[PDB]
Amino acid sequence: QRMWWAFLASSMVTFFGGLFIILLWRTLKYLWTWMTSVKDWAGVMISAQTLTGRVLVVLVFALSIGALVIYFIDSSNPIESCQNFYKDFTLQIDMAFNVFFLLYFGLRFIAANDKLWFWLEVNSVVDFFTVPPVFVSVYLNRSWLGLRFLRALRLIQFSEILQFLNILKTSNSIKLVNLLSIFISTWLTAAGFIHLVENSGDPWENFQNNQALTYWECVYLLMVTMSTVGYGDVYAKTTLGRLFMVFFILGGLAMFASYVPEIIELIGNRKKYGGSYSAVSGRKHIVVCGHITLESVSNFLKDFLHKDRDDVNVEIVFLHNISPNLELEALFKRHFTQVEFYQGSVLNPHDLARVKIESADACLILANKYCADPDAEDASNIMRVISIKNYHPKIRIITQMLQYHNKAHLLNIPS
Amino acid sequence: LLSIFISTWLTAAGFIHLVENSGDPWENFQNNQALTYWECVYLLMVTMSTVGYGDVYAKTTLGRLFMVFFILGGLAMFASYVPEIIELIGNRKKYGGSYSAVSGRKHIVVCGHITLESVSNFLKDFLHKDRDDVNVEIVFLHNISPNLELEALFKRHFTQVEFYQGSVLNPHDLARVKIESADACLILANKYCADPDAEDASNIMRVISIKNYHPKIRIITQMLQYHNKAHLLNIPSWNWKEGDDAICLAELKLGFIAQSCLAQGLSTMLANLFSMRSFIKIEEDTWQKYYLEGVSNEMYTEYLSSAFVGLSFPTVCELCFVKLKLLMISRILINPGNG
Amino acid sequence: MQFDTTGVNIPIITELVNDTNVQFLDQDDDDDPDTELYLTQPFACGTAFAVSVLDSLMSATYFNDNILTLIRTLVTGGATPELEALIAEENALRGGYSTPQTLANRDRCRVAQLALLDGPFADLGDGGCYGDLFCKALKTYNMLCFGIYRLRDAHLSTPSQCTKRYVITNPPYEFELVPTDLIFCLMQFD
Ligand SMILES: CC(C)CCC[C@@H](C)[C@H]1CC[C@H]2[C@@H]3CC=C4C[C@@H](O)CC[C@]4(C)[C@H]3CC[C@]12C
Ligand SMILES: CC(C)CCC[C@@H](C)[C@H]1CC[C@H]2[C@@H]3CC=C4C[C@@H](O)CC[C@]4(C)[C@H]3CC[C@]12C
Ligand SMILES: CC(C)CCC[C@@H](C)[C@H]1CC[C@H]2[C@@H]3CC=C4C[C@@H](O)CC[C@]4(C)[C@H]3CC[C@]12C
Ligand SMILES: CC(C)CCC[C@@H](C)[C@H]1CC[C@H]2[C@@H]3CC=C4C[C@@H](O)CC[C@]4(C)[C@H]3CC[C@]12C
Numbered sequence: 018q019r020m021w022w023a024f025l026a027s028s029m030v031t032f033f034g035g036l037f038i039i040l041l042w043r044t045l046k047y048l049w050t051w052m053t054s055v056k057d058w059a060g061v062m063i064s065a066q067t068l069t070g071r072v073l074v075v076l077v078f079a080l081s082i083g084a085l086v087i088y089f090i091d092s093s094n095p096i097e098s099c100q101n102f103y104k105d106f107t108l109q110i111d112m113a114f115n116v117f118f119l120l121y122f123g124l125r126f127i128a129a130n131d132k133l134w135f136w137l138e139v140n141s142v143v144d145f146f147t148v149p150p151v152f153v154s155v156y157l158n159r160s161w162l163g164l165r166f167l168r169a170l171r172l173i174q175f176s177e178i179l180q181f182l183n184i185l186k187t188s189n190s191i192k193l194v195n196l197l198s199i200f201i202s203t204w205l206t207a208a209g210f211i212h213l214v215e216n217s218g219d220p221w222e223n224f225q226n227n228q229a230l231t232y233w234e235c236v237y238l239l240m241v242t243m244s245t246v247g248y249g250d251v252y253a254k255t256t257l258g259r260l261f262m263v264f265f266i267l268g269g270l271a272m273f274a275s276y277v278p279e280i281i282e283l284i285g286n287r288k289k290y291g292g293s294y295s296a297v298s299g300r301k302h303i304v305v306c307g308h309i310t311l312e313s314v315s316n317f318l319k320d321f322l323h324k325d326r327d328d329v330n331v332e333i334v335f336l337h338n339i340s341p342n343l344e345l346e347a348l349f350k351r352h353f354t355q356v357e358f359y360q361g362s363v364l365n366p367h368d369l370a371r372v373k374i375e376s377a378d379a380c381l382i383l384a385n386k387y388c389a390d391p392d393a394e395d396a397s398n399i400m401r402v403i404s405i406k407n408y409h410p411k412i413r414i415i416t417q418m419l420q421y422h423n424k425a426h427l428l429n430i431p432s
Numbered sequence: 433l434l435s436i437f438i439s440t441w442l443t444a445a446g447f448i449h450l451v452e453n454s455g456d457p458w459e460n461f462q463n464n465q466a467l468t469y470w471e472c473v474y475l476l477m478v479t480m481s482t483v484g485y486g487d488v489y490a491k492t493t494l495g496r497l498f499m500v501f502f503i504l505g506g507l508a509m510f511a512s513y514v515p516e517i518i519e520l521i522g523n524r525k526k527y528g529g530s531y532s533a534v535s536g537r538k539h540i541v542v543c544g545h546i547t548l549e550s551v552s553n554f555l556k557d558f559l560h561k562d563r564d565d566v567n568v569e570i571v572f573l574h575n576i577s578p579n580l581e582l583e584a585l586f587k588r589h590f591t592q593v594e595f596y597q598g599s600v601l602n603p604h605d606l607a608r609v610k611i612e613s614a615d616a617c618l619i620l621a622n623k624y625c626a627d628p629d630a631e632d633a634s635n636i637m638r639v640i641s642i643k644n645y646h647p648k649i650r651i652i653t654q655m656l657q658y659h660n661k662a663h664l665l666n667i668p669s670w671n672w673k674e675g676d677d678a679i680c681l682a683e684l685k686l687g688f689i690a691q692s693c694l695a696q697g698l699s700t701m702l703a704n705l706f707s708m709r710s711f712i713k714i715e716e717d718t719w720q721k722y723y724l725e726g727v728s729n730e731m732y733t734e735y736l737s738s739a740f741v742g743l744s745f746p747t748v749c750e751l752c753f754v755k756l757k758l759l760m761i762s763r764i765l766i767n768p769g770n771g
Numbered sequence: 772m773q774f775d776t777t778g779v780n781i782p783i784i785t786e787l788v789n790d791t792n793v794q795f796l797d798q799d800d801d802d803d804p805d806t807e808l809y810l811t812q813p814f815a816c817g818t819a820f821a822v823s824v825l826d827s828l829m830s831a832t833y834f835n836d837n838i839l840t841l842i843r844t845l846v847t848g849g850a851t852p853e854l855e856a857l858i859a860e861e862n863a864l865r866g867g868y869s870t871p872q873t874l875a876n877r878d879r880c881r882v883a884q885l886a887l888l889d890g891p892f893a894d895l896g897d898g899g900c901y902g903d904l905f906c907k908a909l910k911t912y913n914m915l916c917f918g919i920y921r922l923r924d925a926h927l928s929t930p931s932q933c934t935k936r937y938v939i940t941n942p943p944y945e946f947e948l949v950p951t952d953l954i955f956c957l958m959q960f961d
């Protein structure tokens with residue numbers, strides 16, 4: 018007949034029987050009615066501390082991707098089907114992938130501490146809903162596109178497994194990969210839900226609500242919905258699809274409007290003024306650091322690039338940890354061919370080699386005159402001349418101080 | 433928020449159901465568009481979410497007027513309520529719950545100033561290969577929830593470390609982390625603080641709370657002065673004879689300086705002996721190669737053999753190093769001369 | 772500073788609070804913010820010492836109880852628990868009339884730094900039998916060696932004028948020996 022119910026029934030009875038079986042075990046423990054070694058072996062297999070665990074978790078990554086592509090393949094098939102695994106390539110790989118997933122879930126269940134909280138974990142729920150029905154299908158020699166769309170929720174663990182494999186270390190990239198994985202996973206998962214529910218007819222309507230939709234059409238529908246465009250060229254006509262859409266958009270709109278600005282922020286906010294200064298052959302260049310603001314740079318650049326001074330082939334390379342504003346960038350765009358900017362502190366020898374201070378003709382330091390503490394600004398200039406002489410002592414520093422006793426402190430430097 | 437949102441959603445949907453279902457008197461009731469209540473509910477959720485599918489809408493002019501006068505309130509209500517409800521649901525305690533005491537395995541508890549670099553510098557020295565294999569687990573306890581980088585460090589040393597959020601000044605938290613069943617408590621002090629007496633005071637209160645809960649535990653802590661050692665001694669169960677540690681960073685630094693002040697180099701000579709440093713090797717013979725040959729040594733305690741303990745300890749000094757290829761140094765006894 | 776010599780050879784030791792400030796102390800070194808404090812030059816010379824190297828003491832004192840006792844009695848001058856109790860009761864060390872048991876508190880095997888170029892142990896200064904060197908130290912005065920405080924360019928053939936010495940902990944048996952050397956040794960208590 019149309020044996021669709023057996024897959025959902027098998028997944029549900031495995032899930033709820035493990036949940037009920039776990040509760041029964043707790044009752045037996047009450048009133049007296051090597052496990053650690055196999056558990057922490059499973060733990061070091063789950064974590065990427067060993068080479069075996071590393072190849073295991075990269076295989077989990079790769080075969081989750083592969084099962085997702087297999088679902089994207091089988092989405093173009095009819096809903097109910099009759100297929101022999103030996104006879105056709107379909108389900109030949111998916112079977113092996115779900116065998117591996119069953120093994121991986123077994124390892125994770127051994128490694129887990131609290132059985133009920135492990136059972137109530139989304140990465141376990143996706144296993145409970147995906148690995149039974151493919152075995153049910155390959156036993157029954159039939160096929161139903163059941164909850165095979167749930168395999169996109171295996172993308173939810175990409176940030177965790179890259180944290181295991183040490184590719185993700187910094188907080189920006191960790192939050193970025195988390196947001197991307199969560200967004201893409203829930204987009205594809207709810208689109209597969211709408212594909213199944215919309216494609217299948219409605220029992221009250223006697224399955225006359227089976228609107229012919231592709232998975233990519235449902236994907237486009239959900240991106241229109243989460244972006245709140247609402248074209249209405251294609252929508253949900255089944256009442257189960259409409260109910261899922263109503264219950265979806267409450268989460269989905271808040272998720273979209275809080276995630277997509279954050280992802281757009283985390284991508285592209287980079288270092289625009291990094292990189293090295295090319296030392297032009299046959300032309301000296303100077304380096305200017307210190308208190309660098311718009312009016313100070315302008316008052317320096319007019320005196321340095323004035324017609325009355327003899328023509329200067331020397332270029333000017335700035336160095337300042339604060340990225341400049343738009344007006345300072347416009348000043349640089351004005352004196353484009355003569356000045357370059359490079360972001361960075363002067364207290365980094367990598368920055369000093371980046372601006373080529375050893376190949377530079379003379380370093381200059383501009384002190385902040387109008388400061389609230391004439392000893393603290395003095396101290397900052399002290400530390401700057403210290404760092405430049407620490408990197409390369411064979412350079413000429415032209416600086417400006419604020420008192421006379423600080424001249425002796427400058428003289429304290431050996432070079 | 434839930435009650436107000438659900439109430440006004442269902443109420444305005446019922447309004448649209450009545451008005452839309454009933455025809456229009458000007459149209460002689462020819463505007464009676466056949467709609468169900470759940471269809472109107474779906475319509476209003478589409479409208480409040482600003483999707484606007486247009487598969488089903490209001491065709492009566494009274495329904496259209498109500499929709500126009502509705503959406504002014506409804507959109508602001510939706511966009512100010514649904515983010516708030518989504519915030520209030522789910523922002524929970526992810527690092528609560530108890531620490532399962534693994535049988536046949538001791539565990540320690542580490543609290544105090546806990547940040548990413550401090551935890552990393554502690555964990556490399558604690559989990560280093562040069563140290564003997566340790567089955568002891570590490571249970572942290574800190575009231576601030578960690579950031580993503582500290583969580584990534586925990587995911588790195590997953591099987592060896594666990595985290596549990598909470599202050600140390602709560603005996604429920606202490607029973608939660610099983611400090612009575614813990615082997616030894618550790619307290620990491622914030623070195624770089626704006627007030628070396630206030631950070632000292634916080635460490636004082638932490639050792640006070642741990643000894644108030646369970647006085648039979650070994651506390652290894654670090655202070656910032658020398659007079660605070662007397663304040664630690666003020667605690668009744670803070671006894672030097674029983675195993676305990678009260679490191680005084682400033683006092684130790686001054687002692688190392690005053691020892692190198694007569695034997696230049698001895699400060700770093702001692703300080704290299706406690707970072708567990710594996711034998712790294714560089715190709716060329718600089719000073720760094722012969723110095724990493726130095727820093728690969730650490731300090732270990734080994735029970736003497738019956739030969740070694742037997743006869744004279746001063747006699748067993750000579751040729752001890754060559755026989756075991758080790759450096760040999762019932763109380764504090766260095767240079768044994770004259771079990 | 773300069774004198775009727777220069778002041779670069781003057782042995783100083785400065786505390787630090789930033790590990791990332793240690794590059795400013797010297798000039799003849801490949802300074803690097805990635806190079807750790809144990810690996811950089813002036814800490815290895817011993818002229819710089821920050822407090823942040825004591826984080827490993829927590830793990831050390833956990834893994835052996837005797838480590839803090841040993842470091843205290845080697846470093847601050849033998850803090851006996853009687854001295855700690857007298858500190859907690861008085862907050863000022865006092866003086867007392869000596870006795871033979873009081874004069875038996877001279878028996879701390881003292882730290883010292885001796886020269887290898889001149890002295891009763893200078894009879895070899897060009898060997899490589901560092902093992903025989905410390906065995907001669909044993910059979911002479913039970914002088915426990917620690918390690919060689921050799922100059923930085925003392926392992927070079929190109930003669931420089933750098934008097935900055937760096938420590939080496941636990942030299943093996945087959946470790947060489949230049950005569951221009953200072954040694955970390957402990958003779959018996961006075
Ligand atoms: C947790 C699980 C067990 C609950 C899921 C409900 C499933 C197992 C039950 C509820 C209603 C049931 C169906 C009701 C009537 C049909 C038609 C009949 O000719 C064969 C049995 C069949 C196909 C039943 C078997 C599967 C079924 C869908
Ligand atoms: C469904 C469950 C029970 C599957 C468990 C499979 C068990 C029986 C087998 C598969 C691989 C095995 C492990 C292989 C090697 C490790 C490390 C070794 O130094 C001691 C035994 C230990 C720790 C074994 C424990 C038992 C083990 C985990
Ligand atoms: C899934 C949950 C959360 C939403 C509630 C949906 C279920 C319980 C309700 C809402 C609409 C209902 C349908 C209303 C009309 C007919 C009546 C009768 O012929 C039984 C089947 C059928 C088709 C009902 C099946 C049960 C039903 C689908
Ligand atoms: C309810 C309030 C706030 C909105 C104003 C609506 C009322 C006052 C107005 C706007 C449109 C009007 C309709 C305009 C066209 C015809 C004209 C004549 O045949 C009387 C009935 C009828 C059908 C009118 C009834 C009164 C009316 C419904």
Ligand SMILES: [Ca+2]
Binds near residue numbers: 799
């Ligand atoms: Ca330097």
Ligand SMILES: [Mg+2]
Binds near residue numbers: 356
């Ligand atoms: Mg240029």
Ligand SMILES: [Mg+2]
Binds near residue numbers: 590591593594
């Ligand atoms: Mg554990």
